[PDB]
Design a protein around this nucleic acid. Structure first.
Lengths: 107, 178, 51, 232, 100
RNA sequence: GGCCGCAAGGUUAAAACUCAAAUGAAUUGACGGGGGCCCGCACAAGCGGUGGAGCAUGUGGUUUAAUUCGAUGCAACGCGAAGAACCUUACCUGGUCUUGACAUCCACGGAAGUUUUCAGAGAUGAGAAUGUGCCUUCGGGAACCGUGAGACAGGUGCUGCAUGGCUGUCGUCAGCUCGUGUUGUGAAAUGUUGGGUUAAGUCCCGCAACGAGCGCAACCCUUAUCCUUUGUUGCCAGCGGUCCGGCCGGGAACUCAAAGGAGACUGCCAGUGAUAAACUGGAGGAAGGUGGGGAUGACGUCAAGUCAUCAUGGCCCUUACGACCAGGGCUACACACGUGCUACAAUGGCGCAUACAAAGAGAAGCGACCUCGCGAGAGCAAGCGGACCUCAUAAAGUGCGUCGUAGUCCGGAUUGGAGUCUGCAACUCGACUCCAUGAAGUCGGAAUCGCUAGUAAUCGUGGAUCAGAAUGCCACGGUGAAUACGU
């Protein structure tokens, strides 16, 4: 697993955002399994979802580049910023967090 | 401006020397608010002077006083692209303050067995000066000589104000009459 | 001064109490009460004891 | 920016307190808390309701409660039976006996407290509303006060954000101590949020219930009396 | 704030009490100044240990009306910002703005 | 493509594509390393602190089972959460409960309650003894406890861009605004700008502008010169005992306490100026220009802060974002910062002698004399609810001896040992006292901040909060400067 943010420090701005996951390999033939966490009340209102729609988008990202199989994905934490973030963003963020991680790890 | 105008801050004379300049010399020697100590230092430090010069305390005293501190100093700042320290007359009272600070300044020089002896030190140093500070400051004189440079402005002050001018400074801006 | 934060600020208020000997050194049927109240209350508070 | 309550400044120089009893340090707090308990325990009977708000005294060795109505027939009830039930409700709450209280208000749209709330009740709820304030002011002018301001906030018009409107007539000085006068500020609940109302009423240059200084002593203090000189 | 912290404090006042409170008068002479040993040992000193909690250390308390802690006066038993309100409001007798 | 010229170059002069405007003018807002002008400790003219050293303390960083956060240049960091062993508490580990620790409707079984043993870290569980109350028609009912269901309670749990109430800050800055008339097709102008003057849209003068409201300013608190009533828990001039406390006989001149009254308006005189307003000079006055200080924060704003006072909508768990208990954590650690403390001494330290305060708390509390101990402190105990008492010979300062720049006769972080204190309990991780030990520090970079006089600088005291426990915060009195040309 892993975390990813889009935050920057040189311009006035900060462009924050950020999420942390657990992506862990499963027994062969288990397929694709989902958990959140922060969606109890904080991530969630349309944001629960999205992060799940983000994984479904993420099926068209990767290293080889396509589909997830197996594996379980857990949305452990994250932080939006209210006047720039939306459901989404999260999602756009969440398949980048999933791609980076898969790149870090190795496929 | 500021705005706002008001100056120095009145002082009583401090009880030994009956003078406001003495403090004033107490503070300009004072640290922190210990005026009792600091008075005790200034009278000790003059009693040593102080034995260190002359034979008394006050004769220093004016030698340091004279140093030490002046008559000139410098004013800032700024003129075109730069800032300069241009010479002016001190401030009559400040200076001092000049300084009283130079004699205490520094001191502090430092060294250390008593203030303080440090007074002080210098009065002995300064003061004869020859003391540090007297050299202080000379630096004032530096200066500043540096700076002599000029300051006026820059064109406008030197700048645009033609009056009597010989400048053409300050006054409106003047033609004939009415 | 704020519900939350802060420098600085803070905050300032007062209350507070006048007092106290009136304070009288002896009771009387009309000063008894009040004496009753005075306490009856509330806006005043009254002690009577000699101590 | 932010302001003082006209109020409150304020008290003890132009305006009475809130409650009026002695407590503290060993009983002050607690109490103060009883309170606070009276509040909440009595005021849910008042809320239905024309009471604006209440004042507490505490005399004692009782409690407490002076009530300004608004309304008074609606809180007194048939032959006074409720004012006896009011309270019995004091108490309950609390540790002493409790007494009610009467209060009369008020010129009722003069307030604020009762004017607000009258517009808070319309906004609760919700009605066309908006309006309301205009109104309320007219109202209040109206019945009495030399000027009145009203302000209504929270979110306004149903919403997404937040919000606020005001009106206001005559006025209304602010810094004049001071005085007085008033004043407020009351809220809240509705299905979209909290709703809030302020009211400020300038009565003119008139003296208050006190304050701050007493009248002159020298008439007070006179020199002609006998004394101390103690301590004997 | 929470109703559990309020609560707890009123439970704790409470219990404590039966214990503190009465205990404490014993502590300390049964250990500490004091104590004989017969004590302190613990055990006799378990009289202090068993209730805990009821202890003043904890009892604390805190406000209270709002309940909250670490932000109240206490002389009034009140929060704080609620003292403050309150004050404007005049709900506390004699209490006013502040100036000097 | 054509045309002109030796030619660079000139000339005639498109289209496809593409954007949703581009463009002239004027008004309002806002801005300038454009002009004029006024002011603020804004800068100078000065004084003193701050950066380097060690520590106090909050935030960030690193770390951890956990280290509760929010805030984050102004608008954050000794702030809100004013005093985290525990509780408080957010967090972690382990134990443990599910109509619940708290709460309402309803029914069923028991009065509430008291006493008591044992397992267990305790929560919790089981056993044993014991009371039989209150209202009453003595039927029955209520209180309080236990059990049980549909609801539901509970949530320091999210959302401050859902919202109220409250607050920061520009800043006590001099501004803000409406009605009517006039003026412009209009934004809007006029008034609110001009002239004199001011701390100021302050005051006065004057014009197609006029009329009116809010802010500025008074009120109201505080400080102190004076007039006056009064006299203990206060005072003491002339009288008196007391080997010297107004203790007490005595006294009311006086201090003080705190109640009422007087005073300041450029008023008055002289000068300037539009014979204005105002300003300068002077007398009178305790004080001269709201005498000084405070409360006071308009209109408007950062799409400011507040789910952590409080309120309350939305969203969400109750198989718990609830709740009980023992222990742990909030305090860990090669870091960095914001803010604070303390020293480097000699107009300082140390030992002895020694003078002059304000303010504030105290009914399971404060506390002298006296007794015990080296001492924290404890014992004993007058007094008191404080104008009645204690902190208390306040310290700096004053008198005397001593030190000579030596890392000291300074500093005294660190570190060993022992004693005292609150509390269930001082292991991580509190405070105080005694003995011993011992380090950086020689007045500190790029740099920087507060202050115009009873101010700064500098010395001590008290309180909230508070079982106990500040070098922060709030308030107090002592000593008490330098300099202010210039703009």
């Amino acid at each position: 697993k892993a975390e990813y943010t889009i935050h920057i420090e040189v311009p006035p701005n900060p462009f924050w955002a950020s999420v942390g996951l657990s992506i862990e390999p499963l027994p062969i033939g288990s397929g694709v399994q989902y958990e959140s966490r922060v969606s109890l009340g904080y991530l969630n209102q349309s944001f629960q979802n999205a992060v799940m729609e983000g994984v479904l988008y993420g099926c068209e990202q990767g290293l080889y580049g396509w589909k997830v199989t197996d594996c379980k994905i857990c949305f452990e934490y994250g932080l939006y910023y209210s006047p720039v973030s939306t459901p989404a963003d999260f999602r756009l963020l969440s398949p980048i967090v999933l791609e980076q991680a898969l790149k870090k790890a190795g496929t | 401006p500021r705005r706002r105008v008001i100056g120095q801050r009145k002082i009583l004379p401090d009880p030994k020397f009956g003078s406001e300049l003495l403090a004033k010399f107490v503070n300009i020697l004072m640290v922190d608010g210990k005026k009792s100590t600091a008075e005790s230092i200034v009278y000790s430090a003059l009693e040593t002077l102080a034995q260190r010069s002359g034979k008394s305390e006050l004769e220093a005293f004016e030698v340091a006083l004279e140093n030490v501190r002046p008559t000139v100093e410098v004013k800032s700042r700024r003129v075109g692209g730069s800032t300069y320290q241009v010479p002016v007359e001190v401030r009559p009272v400040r200076r001092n303050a000049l300084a009283m600070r130079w004699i205490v300044e520094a001191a502090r020089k430092r060294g250390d067995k008593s203030m303080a002896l440090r007074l002080a030190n210098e009065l002995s140093d300064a003061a004869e000066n020859k003391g540090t500070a007297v050299k202080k400051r000379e630096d004032v004189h530096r200066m500043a000589e540096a700076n002599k440079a000029f300051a006026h402005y820059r064109w406008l002050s030197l700048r645009s104000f033609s009056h009597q001018a010989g400048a053409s400074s300050k006054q409106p801006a003047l033609g004939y009459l009415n | 001064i704020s519900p939350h934060v802060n420098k600085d600020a803070r905050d300032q208020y007062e209350i507070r109490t006048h007092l106290r000997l009136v304070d009288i050194v002896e009771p009387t049927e009309k000063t008894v009460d009040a004496l009753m109240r005075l306490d009856l209350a509330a806006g005043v508070d009254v002690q009577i004891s000699l101590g | 920016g932010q302001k003082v309550h006209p109020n409150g400044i304020r008290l003890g120089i132009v305006k009475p307190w809130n409650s009026t009893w002695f407590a503290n340090t060993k009983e002050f707090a607690d109490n103060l808390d009883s309170d606070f308990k009276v509040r909440q325990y009595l005021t849910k009977e008042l809320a239905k309701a024309s009471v604006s708000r209440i004042v507490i005294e505490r005399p004692a060795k009782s409690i407490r409660v002076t009530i300004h109505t608004a309304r008074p027939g609606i809180v007194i009830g048939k032959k006074g039976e409720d004012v006896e039930k009011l309270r019995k409700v004091v108490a309950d709450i609390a540790g002493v006996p409790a007494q009610i209280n009467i209060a009369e208000v008020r010129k009722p749209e003069l307030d604020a407290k009762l004017v607000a709330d009258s517009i808070t009740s319309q906004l609760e709820r919700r009605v066309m509303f908006r309006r309301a304030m205009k109104r309320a002011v007219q109202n209040a002018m109206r019945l009495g006060a030399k000027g009145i301001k009203v302000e209504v906030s929270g979110r306004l018009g149903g919403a997404e954000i937040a919000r606020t409107e005001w009106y206001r007539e005559g006025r209304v000085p602010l810094h004049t101590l001071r005085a007085d006068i008033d004043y407020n500020t009351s809220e809240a609940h509705t299905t979209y949020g909290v709703i809030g109302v302020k009211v400020w009423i300038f009565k003119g240059e008139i003296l208050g219930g006190m304050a701050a200084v007493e009248q002159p002593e020298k008439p007070a203090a006179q020199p002609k009396k006998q004394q101390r000189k103690g301590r004997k | 704030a929470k109703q559990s912290m309020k609560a707890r404090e009123v439970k704790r006042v409470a219990l404590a009490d039966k214990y503190f409170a009465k205990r404490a008068e014993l502590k300390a002479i049964i250990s500490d100044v004091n104590a004989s040993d017969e004590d302190r040992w613990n055990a006799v000193l378990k009289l202090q240990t068993l209730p805990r909690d009821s202890s003043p250390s904890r009892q604390r308390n805190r406000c209270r009306q709002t309940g909250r802690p670490h932000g109240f006066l206490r002389k009034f038993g009140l929060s704080r910002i609620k003292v403050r309100e309150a004050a404007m409001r005049g709900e506390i007798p004699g209490l006013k703005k502040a100036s000097w």
